């Protein structure tokens, strides 16, 4: 016996099978809910109204859960439990709420605020219905950690990620009130007690620190400039990180102990490190309020004493006006300089610091990447630096594609971080001695034995458990004055990294992802629910998800593209790469060369050797002349053999007979395996005609510049099932050439290229033997630039095969070619000026 209740919002509907015993109460609740629900609109784009049935059921859960009291037993207990159980069974197929929240964003038109409202309501419901998170979630990632197929490390961010950090604390107080309401009230009480206890704290906290009043009423929340000042921003960034931790612990059904013991290790960036050591002390929910109280008390005293040591003073209006007119930030005590090496930046700061006195000197403070540094000093000094830099940088929109690589003006961004104090600088040193007394007055000491997981120092990367001195004093020293070598500390082996830190997509996680792309390390942003389009780093949902979509491993290029050996039944050994696997021949090609491969006898002789070669269209001026060439190639090769055709693009009058020719010859079934276009990457449209109209196996493209590589990646993505053969040659190549270095563009673009499995990446230019190509096959070539290994699928030899027997090149020309000494890659660009190893660059026809 069950009378169904029909609950609606315009077009979208849901049906609840309410038992006949309690339907009286459910009909009242249905009426009241439908009265509160606003009048439906088209699309549902209007706020406070559901977009999907799942949201509506959420809003109902939320509405009921508001009325029910968690202590007193009302009549609404049974209707709440029944609509929860019905919502679970219908929408959360065993999976976690965040998995459904994610699914709605990437499928439906649901906005992010409506999703967060749903999650709030579902969690609120679950807690008010006396249904806590007792049972351990079956999270894929945490299952895989128990088994041993995943190693989790927890990283905690710091300052300089976002200017609007407090909204992250507002979103936690709103969305997860019933989980972290008790934490935030405890932290706000501890802070309020420290203000009174500390002799002169009211002086540094001008507008008070009543964080609860600022959470309830966004009208009483002070301006961003006050909030950002370190005596607030330090403890509150702690609170946000600990809250994201608790939320993660509660939704997984773990106590902080269990969640800590599932981590191989933890570390932090700046004041993050204070959290990471407090996390490592955690055992059970009863003893978590001492581990938080430590981390709040430390972050409070750091933030107070470091402000008393170098308080931010009014900047001259002229300086602020200049900075805004040059598209730079608002001068702060920390400046981020992207796309310059650490030597280059240290050269500039050494020049700037030569003219400045001791108490105004800048210094490199964060080493975030190879080419990502943060300089910390007085904001004027850093404006000084910023002027020296704006002199040296090229214009941002300047095209240098036609300038030789060495003569190119170095390009680099530089913006001020949103931060109020100069962390990791000499300016905060006087604070040190004051902090190390405030910790021993409030009996705040981190002991080695109480830390159960290794926590990595930000300076040298060594564990903090194996120190002789105080860990609290060493952490303070690591935050206030000692620099942060992020690459050095994150040298730990781990498949998964959880960015608890503030900043979401602009936080420490995404930075750490960029640092160790292609090593097979998945970063998961554990604080922010969102949809990644590229899906290269995870969000909140991946931690909770119970399906295969919970455990996503990032590609390790050395493993995904490791070159192997294989053999036929005939016992012939092949080098097995993405490229050779398609064509069933060694991954060595002779590219279309005018006039070396215009000869049908050379094309046939190379094909007969079992090696792929392009017939150069450049040596033909008519469909008949090129038909007679192809006919001659086909008469000289064994049955089943194939070759390809190279067409120049800087010769557009050839393509208008050559492309229709290939189309006609493929329609008669001529053994043309593939077409390569030299001297320019076609547009998306013409490339799409070449792909489907020509009936080739694969398309070859020879990008010249980064912009051209990007164009090839676009053509690949448009047709994800068609194999594209991205033939990359540097400017060091024979014949028409680019201005580009052979390595640099591959370092930038290799990651992006491997995101498209249909691209078969072939390296050309400057190759003669197996000795010089082996590093590119293995991928070890890219270790010399401190990148991870980046294996290549195959190789092309142009200049090398010009003196072969079967090449029509005249004996005296072959003697002239053999005479040319040639030069190493470092000295290739001299061909633009003078004869260099018997070679020179000229402007062609």
Ligand X SMILES: *OP(=O)(O)OCC(C)(C)[C@@H](O)C(=O)NCCC(=O)NCCSC(=O)/C=C/C
* Dihedral, 367, 370, 371, 377 alpha carbons, nearest 10: 10
Name the one range near ligand X by CB under 6 A: 150-158, 374-382, 436-444, 675-683. Answer: 675-683
SS3 243: helix
**How far, in Å, CA of 135 to CA of 594, rounded?**
71
| CB of 576 vs other proteins, minimal distance in Å | 7
Residue 592 binding partner per list ligand X, other proteins, ligand FMN, none, with a CB distance cut-off of 5 to 8 Å that depends on partner kind: ligand FMN
Residue ranges in 369-428 that form contacts with other proteins under rule CB under 8 A: 399, 401-402
Phi-psi region of 198 (alpha: psi -120 to 50; beta: other; left: phi over 0): beta
Give all strands (DSSP E) within 148-307, no chain letters. 152-156, 263-268
Residue 96 Cβ vs other proteins, minimum distance, rounded to whole Å: 29
Q: Under the criterion CB under 6 A, does residue 742 sit at the interface with ligand FMN?
A: no
What is the number of alpha carbons within 13 Å of residue 437 lying toward its C-beta? 7
| 181: partner contacted, choices ligand FMN, other proteins, ligand X, none (Cβ within 5-8 A by kind) | none
Which residue, 538 or 658, is less far from other proteins as judged by CB? 658
Q: Does 738 bind ligand X (CB under 6 A)?
A: yes
Q: 537 vs 620, which CB is nearer to ligand FMN?
A: 620
Crossing angle of helices 177-197 and 166-175, rounded to 10°: 130
Q: Which of 151, 541, 729, 782 binds ligand X (CB under 6 A)?
A: 729
- Which part of the chain contacts ligand X (CB under 6 A), choosing from 204-212, 223-231, 607-615, 676-684? 676-684
Residue (136 or 567) nearer to other proteins, CB? 567
Catalytic residue check, 270:
yes
Strand order in the sheet with 363-367: 414-416, 334-338, 372-376, 363-367, 484-485
Question: What string marks each residue from 657 to 686 as x (binds ligand FMN by CB under 6 A) or -?
Answer: ---------------------xx-------
Angle between helices 471-480 and 288-309 (to 10 degrees): 40
563 scored as a contact of other proteins (CB under 8 A): yes
Choose between 233 and 831: whose C-beta lies nearer to ligand FMN.
Answer: 831
Nearest approach, Cβ of residue 180 and other proteins (Å): 43
Write each residue from 694 to 723 as x if it is in contact with other proteins (CB under 8 A), else as -, in one continuous string: --------------x--x--------xx-x
The entry of ligand X, other proteins, ligand FMN, none near residue 798 (CB within 5 to 8 angstroms by kind) is ligand FMN
| Closest separation in Å from C-beta 711 to other proteins | 8
Three-state SS string across 544-612, please? HCCCHHHCCCCCEHHHHCCCEEEECCCCCEEEECHHHHHHCCCCEEECCCCCCCCCHHHHHHHHHCCCE
Contact 798, 735 (CB under 8 A): yes
Query: Is residue 808 part of the contact set for other proteins (CB under 8 A)?
Result: no
With binding defined as CB under 6 A, does residue 798 bind ligand FMN?
yes
The number of angstroms, rounded, from the C-alpha of 413 to the middle of its chain's C-alpha atoms is: 18
What, of ligand X, other proteins, ligand FMN, none, does residue 116 touch, CB below 5 to 8 Å by kind? none
Residue 199 backbone zone (phi > 0: left; psi -120 to 50: alpha; other: beta): alpha
**Closer to ligand FMN by Cβ: residue 26 or 677:** 677
Q: Cα–Cα distance between 666 and 694 in angstroms, integer?
A: 7
Of 53 and 735, CB closest to ligand X: 735
Gap between the Cα atoms of 288 and 442, Å rounded: 17
Residue 593 as a binder of ligand FMN (CB under 6 A): the answer is: yes
Under a CB-based contact definition with an 8 Å cutoff, are residues 84 and 137 in contact?
no
Supply the DSSP symbol for 836. B
Residues 352, 382: Cα–Cα separation, whole Å: 9
591 makes contact with ligand FMN (CB under 6 A): yes
Q: Which residues is 644 bridged to in the sheet?
A: 614, 674
- Work out which of 126, 465, 474, 702 binds ligand FMN, going by CB under 6 A: 702
581 binds other proteins (CB under 8 A): yes
CB burial of residue 331 (10 Å; 0-12, 13-18, 19+): buried
488 makes contact, choosing from other proteins, ligand X, ligand FMN, none, with CB < 5 to 8 Å by partner type, with none
Region 610-629 residues binding other proteins, contact defined as CB under 8 A? 611
3-state secondary structure 287-346: CHHHHHHHHHHHHHHHHHHHHHHCCCCCCCHHHHHHHHHCCCCCCCCEEEEECCCHHHHH
Binding ligand FMN by CB under 6 A: which of 275, 353, 646, 673? Answer: 646
Q: Which residue has the tokens 């690589």?
A: 405
For residue 602, the partner it binds in ligand X, other proteins, ligand FMN, none, with Cβ less than 5 to 8 A by kind, is other proteins
Q: Which of 65, 137, 229, 270 is catalytic?
A: 270
> Is 655 an interacting residue with respect to ligand X (CB under 6 A)?
no
- CB of 333 or CB of 731, closer to ligand FMN: 731
Check: CB of residue 590 under 8 Å from CB of residue 611: yes
Instruction: Name which position in 131, 390, 737, 755 contacts ligand X (CB under 6 A).
Output: 737
The neighbour count for residue 689, using CB atoms within 10 Å, is 12
Rounded to 5 degrees, what are φ and ψ at 658?
-70, -40
Q: Which is nearer to ligand FMN, 176 or 776 (CB)?
A: 776
Q: Does 588 bind other proteins (CB under 8 A)?
A: yes
Query: Binding residues for ligand X, per CB under 6 A?
Result: 594, 618, 648, 650, 678-680, 702, 704, 729, 735-738
What are the residue numbers of the active site? 270
Query: Binding residues for ligand FMN, per CB under 6 A?
Result: 591-594, 596, 616, 618, 646, 648, 678-679, 702, 729, 733-735, 764-767, 796-800
């Amino acid at each position: 016996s069950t009378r169904p209740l029909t609950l609606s919002h315009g077009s979208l509907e849901h049906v609840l099978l309410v038992p006949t015993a309690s339907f009286f109460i459910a009909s009242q609740l249905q009426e009241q809910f439908n009265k509160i629900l606003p009048e439906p609109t088209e699309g549902f784009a209007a706020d406070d109204e559901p977009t999907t049935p799942a949201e509506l059921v959420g809003k109902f859960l939320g509405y009921v859960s508001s009325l029910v009291e968690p202590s007193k037993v009302g009549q609404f207990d049974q209707v709440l439990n029944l609509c929860l159980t019905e919502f679970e069974n219908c929408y959360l197929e065993g999976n976690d709420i965040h998995a459904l929240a994610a699914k709605l964003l990437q499928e439906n038109d649901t906005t992010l605020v409506k999703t967060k409202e749903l999650i709030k309501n579902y969690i609120t419901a679950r807690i008010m219905a006396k249904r806590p998170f007792d049972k351990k979630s079956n999270s894929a990632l945490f299952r895989a950690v128990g088994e041993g197929n995943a190693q989790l490390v927890a990283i905690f961010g710091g300052q300089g990620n976002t200017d609007d950090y407090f909204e992250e604390l507002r979103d936690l107080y709103q969305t997860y009130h019933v989980l972290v309401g008790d934490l935030i009230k405890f932290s706000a009480e501890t802070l309020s007690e420290l203000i009174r206890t500390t002799l002169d704290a009211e002086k540094v906290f001008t507008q008070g620190l009543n964080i609860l009043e600022w959470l309830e009423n966004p009208s009483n929340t002070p301006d961003k400039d006050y909030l950002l000042s370190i005596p607030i921003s330090c403890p509150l960034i702690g609170v946000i990180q600990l809250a994201h931790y608790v939320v993660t612990a509660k939704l997984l059904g773990f106590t902080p102990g269990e969640l800590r013991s599932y981590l191989k290790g933890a570390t932090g960036h700046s004041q993050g490190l204070v959290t990471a050591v407090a996390i490592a002390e955690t055992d059970s929910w009863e003893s978590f309020f001492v581990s938080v109280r430590k981390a709040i008390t430390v972050l409070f005293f750091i933030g107070v004493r470091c402000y008393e040591a170098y308080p931010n003073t009014s900047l001259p209006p002229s300086i602020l006006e200049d900075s805004l007119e040059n598209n730079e930030g608002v001068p702060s005590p920390m400046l981020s300089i992207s796309n310059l090496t650490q030597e280059q930046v240290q050269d500039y700061v050494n020049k700037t610091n030569s003219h400045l006195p001791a108490g105004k000197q800048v210094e490199i403070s964060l080493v975030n990447g190879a080419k990502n540094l943060v300089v910390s000093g007085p904001p004027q000094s850093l404006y000084g630096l910023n002027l020296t830099l704006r002199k040296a940088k090229a214009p941002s929109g300047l095209d240098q594609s036609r300038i030789p690589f060495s003569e190119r003006k170095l390009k680099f961004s530089n913006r001020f971080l949103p931060v109020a104090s100069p962390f990791h600088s000499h300016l905060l040193v006087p604070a040190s001695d004051l902090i190390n007394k405030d910790l021993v007055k409030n009996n705040v000491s981190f002991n080695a034995k109480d830390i159960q997981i290794p926590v990595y120092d930000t300076f040298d990367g060594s564990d903090l458990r194996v120190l002789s001195g105080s860990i609290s004093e060493r952490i303070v020293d690591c935050i206030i004055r000692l620099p942060v070598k992020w690459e050095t500390t994150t040298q730990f082996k781990a498949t998964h990294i959880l960015d608890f830190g503030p900043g979401g997509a602009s936080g420490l996680g995404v930075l750490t992802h960029r640092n160790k792309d292609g090593t097979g390390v998945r970063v998961i942003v554990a604080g922010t629910l969102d949809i990644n389009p590229d899906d290269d780093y995870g969000f909140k949902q991946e931690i909770f998800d119970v399906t295969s979509n919970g455990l996503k491993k990032n590609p390790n290029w050395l493993e995904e593209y490791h070159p192997k050996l294989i053999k036929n039944k005939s016992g012939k050994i092949f080098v097995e790469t993405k490229f050779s696997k398609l064509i069933g021949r060694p991954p060595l090609l002779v590219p279309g060369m005018t006039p070396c491969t215009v000869s049908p006898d050379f094309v046939a002789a190379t094909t007969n050797a079992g090696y792929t070669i392009e017939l150069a269209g450049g040596g033909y001026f008519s469909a008949a002349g090129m038909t007679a060439a192809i006919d001659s190639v086909v008469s000289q090769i064994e049955k089943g053999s194939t070759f390809g055709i190279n067409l120049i693009y800087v010769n557009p009058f050839m393509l208008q007979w050559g492309i229709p020719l290939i189309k006609e010859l493929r329609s008669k079934g001529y053994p043309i395996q593939f077409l390569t276009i030299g001297a320019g990457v076609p547009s998306l449209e013409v490339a799409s005609e070449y792909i489907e109209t020509l009936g080739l196996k694969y398309l070859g493209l020879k990008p010249g510049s980064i912009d051209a590589i990007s164009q090839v990646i676009n053509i690949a993505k448009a047709h994800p099932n068609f194999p594209i053969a991205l033939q990359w040659t540097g400017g060091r190549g024979g014949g028409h050439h680019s201005f580009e270095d052979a390595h640099t563009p591959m370092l930038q673009m290799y990651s992006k290229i491997r995101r498209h499995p249909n691209i078969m990446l072939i390296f050309g230019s400057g190759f003669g033997s197996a000795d010089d190509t082996y590093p590119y096959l293995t991928g070890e070539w890219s270790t010399k630039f401190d990148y991870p290994p980046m294996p290549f699928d195959g190789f092309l030899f142009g200049s090398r095969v010009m003196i072969a027997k079967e090449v029509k090149t005249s004996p005296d020309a072959k003697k002239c070619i053999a005479a040319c000494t040639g030069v190493p890659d470092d000295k290739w660009e001299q061909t633009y000026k003078k004869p260099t190893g018997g070679i020179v660059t000229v402007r062609s026809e």
